[PDB]
Design a protein around this ligand. Structure first.
Ligand code: PEE
Ligand code: PEE
Ligand code: PEE
Ligand code: PEE
Ligand code: PEE
Ligand code: PEE
Ligand code: PEE
Ligand code: PEE
Ligand code: PEE
Ligand code: PEE
Ligand code: PEE
Ligand code: PEE
Lengths: 52, 159, 198, 158, 345, 159, 159, 159
């Protein structure tokens, strides 16, 4: 009866920490990407009859 | 089926093959979009610099060709009955090139976005960006070298 | 918030699960010793080699855009600096080279082992070592890379002010680089006595 | 064989050898980075005052020498032939956490003080000794962590 | 910490702005202008500066101390709009709030013109260009405020700031308009204080709380002294004009509103050391300008802080104010106060 | 009933089929929503450019087909009795085309919103927007390639 | 091997010896720093009060000496063969002085940075700032008294 | 060991002893910190009121004395061989006085800072500030009455 478990075998645990690892990376990479924001000032046409 | 050839063993190869193109694609997108918005801002007033400032957009496309090269080599080392030695090799290869190219990619975006904006204001500042940007494209490479060293040891003397 | 709520809802399940097993006379069922023994030492050894060259490239790529984004802004008025301040991009790249020398040394130790002698004293020893040595070199060069970028973004701005001040701030930028060289040493000492898998 | 010497005990010895560097280098990094912001900031006004104001960066460097020592000694007491008891591994784990968090604490205090002092030193030159005295209290915090971590090492073996 | 995430968005900005400060003139460079004889010699000398060829299009007779203030300011405004263009996110908000204080001035300036029946062109030339919005010249239409509000100023970002202002008279005049102008800054400097405390991180947070506290304290002092010109004003009315963020708040803003004379003001500022001796000696307006520069000089000691955009503008504005002072003195040949220029760099 | 072929093996295959159409439609949708706002802002003043700025909406849709293809193919590999290995191959295929296509949609969305606007003040910029969008479209093509090479190995030499 | 004296019992003592150094140092580092900032700001105007306003920093060093005593004093009580009762009591001794000395720091830092700024203006406030600091320094002394009593019992009437 | 008296029972007691002195010291610290900041401001312009205004600090300090006398009475009831009933109660004695005094500490600091800034403008407010602090100081006494009753029951009629 030296098994670790019938349900939580060592093979399942090694596969669930690696998934946890690759998913931790992914969730970070999608935080950097969401915070992208476009620089709208250099695209719009703005003119003023005061300065020009 | 055996102590040395379980049935969950290919899981680490397939997940490694996938994660090499996933992590390198994300990097080359952050660095294409970010860079790509500076090009769409400077070339409203200086359209003559368009073809010269796509160089950041090139460097990130090479980050993606590396991750494709590792997915192609680990895929042909897969099998229903392979050792657990082989599976973790296939993992570390994808985790190396992927995590390395993701990081290189983001730097290409941040530095390439600034260079295109500056070189419009200072044409002597183009070569300065071409230098800084090669030291990012070479970090995706240093991850590729590790993946290749490991793959060699994959099915060597396995039984 | 939501993300912090889950951190507190995990802590509350690990506690209610631990006390279910304990009060019932089953606290031995949560055994970390077997997990360390029964898990394969190839897992631990192939994470460390990946988390060494991976976490070292994160740091290097980090410092290159702190130092790189300030130089390019400073270089508009003082375009003469981009080749003098180039040395800061060099000390940030080199911590990635340290993570690639390790992976050359450690890859040699990856050998196939017989099935009877897999979970032996020496092959468990060798998986534990290449894991914490890779963590050590990677997480330490991650820190040396972010730091040298901060130091070298200032040295770009000072040099654009006055050429003389550039030399004085390099001394700060050298001492920071020592951190990556010490990490390499400590890792090699760990894995010195480790032997290839039999 | 021996119940007092399982074969996973090396896992806990290396964990401390890694915690003594990753956490001590994170302290030295915080001292140099934040101090150098204060030293370079004034540098556009008073260049003369830089070559004396490297005291905060060389104290941050000593912090990384403390964790080197502790990690070297630990690795010296590890081998795949020696019987490494589990008791010894719990000590080596606390040899590393002690000096690590204590040097992480010293580097946070040296950076915050070294920044403000240099920025304010250019206005007033009679403030120098008081800064240095405050930086000595922030440094002994990293010494207290290694006076403890050299006893634990001695008792873990014998 | 400071530099870990700042450079993702604002690294290029910080570098350009700290290059724009190195072009700020030094004390030695103000002297070389001082010993000039004419304006044709004042032009040749600024060529040696970072101003360069900002007057290459201009002839001898065309030079005036009015045309020099125009092209030195217009060079600041192109630089501002350039930086605001490259910005995004919170940094784009921060740089829009800076402009909401220049259009408040232009609201009050178009309206006073209509009461005196003048042409918009004659007035628009006197308007600051950073305080421009599309419907500014449309305020020349009506005199009733509620008319001006609904038809024009609702669309603006100034709409929240008129809550405490619907007490005007059926007819609208100078002293009523000035009261409106001061209620706006009260609400503007309180919204742009909470904005910094919520979104803008440290150490820029600490520095902008201070710089905005000085703008508040400077107004609360001038608004009191201007009231001494008036006959009598209730105390609870002045309380609706004085902001609530500086060192003065709460203890001294109470004793300022209840100040009948100059001595009653000194009784209120004596319990604060930062502002203790301004009234006692010398010109008052110069004491503030000398304290503004000192705080901005200290903002540049920092790094990885977006407060340098504020500091940079206010420094170069004062630079422009010194150029004009020196220029008038040269043409008018009055050279008694030519050394009045304020410089900390 | 067999060790190589458990009862839980189809679980990974069906997730792999769902995941390929799900993560490509999220990216294909970001791209249309983001670049569809830009088109509608420019073409109130200049609707002569309307049938020329639909290109980011085309290319965002070409992503969503890369997943429909892969999902159909793995659906015909499914069975009650199949190897666990075949289930892992199917999951790796769907994630790779999916999460790499999600990456392609974020890029197309940004560059198409910034590009249509800037092209309204400079017509010579259109030709550069087209290039910057091919380097992003190709990021999804790579994931398809990795998917079809994996699926090719899914049912050969399996017991 | 005895049920009373397992092989994992020294774990609980190690975390107590380490807890006492971890949470006192973080408490002494917070107070020393913030007190150190309030001192520097005032002494520009008035540097003749420098060696008299270094009293908040000394208080915060007495906090870190409270934690060295306990760690030293339980480490002489550690052993290969010991009982769980001895370990549970060493963990309590460290969390007491540790997390009670962390509290004193966050007080000594807040009060020092204020009373130093206020004593430059009114010198009669220097003896108010010292009363309050005594009420803060006393919080870590209570946690030391508890530890020294727990540690006395850890080896008393134990098998 | 025994069914009623197992080996792990002193753990909950050793944690119930520290929880009293840990969570009172955190509450007593939130008190002195805020009230100290209010005191050091008002007594710039009115030093005479300094001694009167130390009253909130004394009230916060008596909180931490409640967590000390409970922790002492628990130390002298611990044992290698004690029952869970004795060990569970010791935890409920410590959480009660601990997390009650934490709550009295936040009330006192927020009131003690308000009335002390406002009493320099009006002296009659002083007896009202005090009357409000008595209600907040009596909260920690209710947690002490509950702890002391429990401990006197932890060893009553026990095997
Ligand atoms: C609620 C359903 C809807 C939502 C679905 C979303 C996904 C949810 C999570 C799916 C994975 C977890 C459930 C499946 C685990 C059980 C599988 C199983 O039986 O495998 C057993 C078998 C071991 O068998 P024996 O050792 O003989 O022991 C006897 C069996 N106990 O072990 C395995 O096959 C382990 C496989 C586990 C894989 C889990 C992870 C799947 C991949 C998910 C990746 C997610 C992160 C993203 C990655 C990005 C980078 C590529
Ligand atoms: C797999 C087993 C092996 C794992 C080895 C891992 C070794 C890595 C060592 C270095 C790691 C450094 C990580 C630093 C992460 C960091 O700073 O994260 C900060 C970040 C801040 O988030 P907030 O601001 O609170 O909320 C979001 C706001 N929008 O917090 C976190 O990331 C929380 C930490 C989570 C760690 C999870 C690690 C899981 C690892 C796999 C286990 C299986
Ligand atoms: C069983 C496995 C369960 C795994 C659950 C994973 C939870 C992930 C949590 C997380 O990182 O959330 C995203 C996090 C939340 O930030 P907050 O500001 O706290 O949001 C709330 C604000 N009111 O935001 C980000 O990281 C940036 C946005 C992109 C996140 C993408 C997350 C994808 C998660 C996929 C999980 C799949 C599991 C299988
Ligand atoms: C082996 C793997 C080990 C995994 C360890 C993971 C550690 C994660 C540490 C997270 C720390 C953190 O973010 O703490 C947040 C929070 C403090 O929030 P405040 O700052 O007070 O919020 C208000 C701010 N205005 O503290 C906590 O979450 C404490 C509880 C953390 C329990 C552990 C969480 C585990 C999460 C899942 C991991 C897989
Ligand atoms: C979900 C469960 C949350 C925790 C409460 C458990 C209640 C319970 O089951 O008590 C009886 C259970 C015995 O169950 P068995 O018959 O052995 O096995 C069947 C288990 N269901 O008791 C125990 O094992 C004791 C467990 C104590 C853990 C701590 C519980 C604290 C609960 C607080 C809840 C507060 C409201 C939210
Ligand atoms: C945390 C996750 C791991 C917890 C493991 C707890 C169970 C365990 O490993 O017990 C081992 C061992 C007992 O061995 P047995 O053979 O079961 O009993 C002795 C037979 N002669 O445990 C001990 O020695 C005691 C350890 C107790 C740890 C505390 C329980 C774990 C959860 C944390 C609880 C924290 C306090 C909670 C208080 C809640 C108040 C509201
Ligand atoms: C899709 C994506 C899915 C992602 C999934 C994310 C999963 C995260 C990890 C979850 C791991 C959970 C493990 C514990 C589960 C559990 O309850 O196990 C109980 C089980 C008992 O089961 P019984 O049936 O009662 O046994 C009867 C025996 N006669 O426990 C055990 O057997 C012991 C298991 C111990 C596991 C401990 C694993 C800890 C791993 C941590 C990472 C390693 C250290 C890394 C250090 C990094 C430092 C920077
Ligand atoms: C605040 C409150 C704090 C409360 C903390 C409670 C901690 C509870 C810990 C419980 C540990 C229980 C250990 C235990 O009993 O596990 C079983 C087993 C012994 O089993 P046997 O008795 O031999 O089985 C006989 C079968 N017939 O335990 C062991 O062998 C291991 C004991 C040590 C447990 C270690 C837990 C995990 C530690 C991870 C450390 C990671 C360090 C990371 C460092 C990072 C540096 C950057
Ligand atoms: C040059 C770029 C290099 C980094 C590129 C991304 C790679 C990510 C993975 C690298 C390995 C890990 C090293 C540590 C990375 C820590 C990164 C970090 O600090 O992340 C921050 C980032 C938040 O950023 P913001 O503060 O929102 O935006 C910036 C505001 N100015 O952190 C996160 O999003 C934390 C997410 C935690 C998710 C945890 C969920 C774990 C689930 C496990 C299964 C259960
Ligand atoms: C991630 C968690 C959320 C998503 C839930 C996904 C559920 C799908 C699970 C797989 C379904 C399935 O077919 O499982 C069958 C299979 C049956 O095994 P046998 O031994 O053959 O049983 C019969 C014996 N006579 O199920 C299992 O044993 C798997 C049990 C583990 C499931 C995975 C749990 C993962 C939990 C992760 C989070 C950890 C806590 C945080
Ligand atoms: C077993 C025992 C486990 C004990 C676990 C204790 C965890 C404590 C975590 C939080 C520590 C916070 C550290 C700290 O700074 O505390 C002292 C500090 C002193 O006051 P200041 O913040 O300086 O006042 C500012 C006035 N403007 O007070 C606080 O921060 C209050 C901390 C409240 C924590 C509440 C935790 C509740 C825990 C419940 C479960 C047990
Ligand atoms: C087993 C029992 C475990 C119980 C754990 C309880 C945790 C206690 C957390 C204490 C937090 C704290 O100190 O908050 C006190 C504070 C009192 O107000 P003051 O700060 O004095 O003034 C406010 C401004 N005028 O109140 C709060 O912050 C509210 C806290 C709400 C806690 C909600 C807990 C819910 C738990 C549900 C369990 C089921």
């Amino acid at each position: 009866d030296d098994i670790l478990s019938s349900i939580w075998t060592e093979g399942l645990l090694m596969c669930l920490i690696v998934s946890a690892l690759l998913l931790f990376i992914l969730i970070v990479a999608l935080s950097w990407i969401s915070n992208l924001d476009i620089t709208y000032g250099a695209l719009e046409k703005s003119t003023n009859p005061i300065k020009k | 089926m055996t102590e040395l050839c379980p049935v969950y063993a290919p899981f680490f190869g397939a997940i490694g093959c996938a994660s090499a193109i996933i992590f390198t694609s994300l990097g080359a997108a952050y660095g294409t979009a970010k860079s790509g918005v500076g090009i769409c801002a400077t070339c409203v007033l200086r359209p003559d610099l368009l073809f010269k400032n796509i160089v950041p957009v090139i460097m990130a496309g090479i980050i993606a060709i590396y991750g494709l090269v590792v997915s192609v080599l680990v895929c042909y080392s897969l099998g229903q009955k392979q050792a657990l030695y082989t599976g973790f090799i296939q993992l570390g290869a994808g985790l190396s090139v992927g995590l390395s190219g993701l990081a290189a990619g983001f730097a290409i975006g941040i530095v390439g976005d600034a260079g295109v904006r500056g070189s419009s204001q200072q044409p002597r500042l183009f070569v300065g960006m071409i230098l800084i940007l090669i030291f990012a494209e070479v970090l995706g490479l240093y991850g590729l070298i590790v993946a290749l060293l490991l793959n060699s040891r994959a099915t060597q003397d396995v039984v | 918030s939501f993300s912090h709520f889950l951190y507190y809802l995990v802590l509350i399940v690990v506690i209610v699960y631990g006390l279910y097993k304990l009060f019932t006379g089953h606290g031995s069922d949560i055994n970390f010793g077997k997990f360390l023994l029964r898990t394969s030492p190839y897992m631990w050894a192939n994470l460390g080699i990946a988390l060494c060259v991976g976490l070292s490239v994160v740091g290097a790529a980090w410092g290159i855009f702190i130092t790189g984004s300030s130089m390019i802004g400073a270089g508009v008025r003082a375009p003469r600096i981009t080749t003098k301040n180039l040395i800061s991009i060099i000390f940030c790249e080199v911590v990635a080279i340290y993570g690639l020398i390790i992976a050359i040394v450690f890859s040699s130790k990856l050998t196939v082992a017989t099935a009877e002698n897999m979970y032996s004293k020496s092959n468990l020893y060798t998986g534990y070592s290449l894991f914490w040595a890779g963590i050590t070199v990677g997480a330490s060069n991650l820190i040396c890379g972010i730091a040298v970028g901060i130091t070298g973004a200032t040295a770009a701005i000072s040099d654009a002010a006055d050429s003389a001040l550039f030399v004085k701030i390099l001394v700060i930028e050298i001492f920071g680089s020592i951190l990556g060289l010490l990490g390499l040493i400590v890792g090699l000492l760990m894995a010195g006595k480790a032997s290839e898998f039999q | 064989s021996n119940i007092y010497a399982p074969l996973y005990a090396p896992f806990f010895g290396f964990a401390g050898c890694a915690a003594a560097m990753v956490l001590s280098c994170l302290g030295a990094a915080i001292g140099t980075a934040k101090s150098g912001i204060g030293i370079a900031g004034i540098g556009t006004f008073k260049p003369e005052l830089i070559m004396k104001s490297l005291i905060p960066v060389v104290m941050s460097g000593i912090l990384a020498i403390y964790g080197l020592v502790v990690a070297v000694l630990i690795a010296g007491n590890l081998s795949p032939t020696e019987d490494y008891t589990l008791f010894n591994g719990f000590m080596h784990l606390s040899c590393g956490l002690c000096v690590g968090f204590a040097c992480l604490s010293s580097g946070y205090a040296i950076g915050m003080v070294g920044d403000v002092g240099v920025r304010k030193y250019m206005h007033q030159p009679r403030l120098f000794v008081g800064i240095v005295l405050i930086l000595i209290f922030s440094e002994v915090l990293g010494l207290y962590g290694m006076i403890v971590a050299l006893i634990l090492n001695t008792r873990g073996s014998e | 910490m400071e530099g870990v995430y700042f450079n993702i968005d604002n690294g290029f900005i910080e570098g350009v702005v700290r290059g724009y400060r190195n072009g700020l003139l030094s004390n030695n460079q103000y002297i070389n202008l001082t010993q000039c004889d004419t304006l044709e010699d004042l032009k040749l000398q600024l060529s040696s500066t970072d101003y360069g060829n900002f007057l290459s299009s201009v002839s001898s007779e065309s030079l005036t101390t009015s045309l020099i203030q125009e092209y030195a300011s217009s060079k600041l405004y192109h630089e501002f709009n350039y930086i605001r263009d490259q910005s995004s996110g919170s940094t784009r908000k921060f740089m829009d709030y800076i402009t909401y204080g220049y259009m408040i001035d232009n609201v009050a300036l178009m309206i006073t013109g209509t009461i005196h029946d003048r042409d918009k062109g004659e007035i628009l030339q006197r308007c600051h260009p950073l305080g421009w919005f599309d419907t500014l010249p449309t305020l020349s239409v009506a005199t009733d405020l509620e008319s001006l509000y609904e038809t024009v100023l609702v669309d603006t970002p100034l709409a929240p700031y008129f809550k405490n202002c619907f007490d005007t008279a059926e007819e609208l005049d100078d002293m009523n308009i000035e009261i409106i102008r001061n209620k706006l800054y009260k609400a503007y400097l309180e919204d742009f204080y909470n904005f910094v405390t919520e979104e803008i991180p440290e150490p820029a947070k600490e520095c902008m709380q201070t710089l905005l506290g000085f703008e508040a304290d400077r107004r609360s002092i001038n608004i009191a002294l201007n009231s001494l010109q008036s006959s009598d004003i209730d105390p609870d009315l002045k309380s609706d004009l004085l902001p609530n963020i500086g060192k003065l708040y709460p203890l001294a803003t109470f004793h300022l509103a209840q100040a009948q004379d100059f001595e009653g003001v000194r009784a209120a500022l004596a319990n604060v050391y930062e502002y203790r001796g301004f009234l006692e000696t010398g010109n008052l307006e110069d004491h503030f300008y000398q304290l503004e520069m000192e705080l901005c000089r200290d903002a540049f000691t920092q790094q990885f802080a977006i407060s340098t955009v504020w500091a940079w503008m206010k420094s170069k504005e004062q630079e422009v104010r010194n150029i004009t002072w020196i220029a008038e003195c040269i043409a008018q040949n009055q050279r008694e106060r030519i050394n009045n220029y304020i410089s900390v760099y």
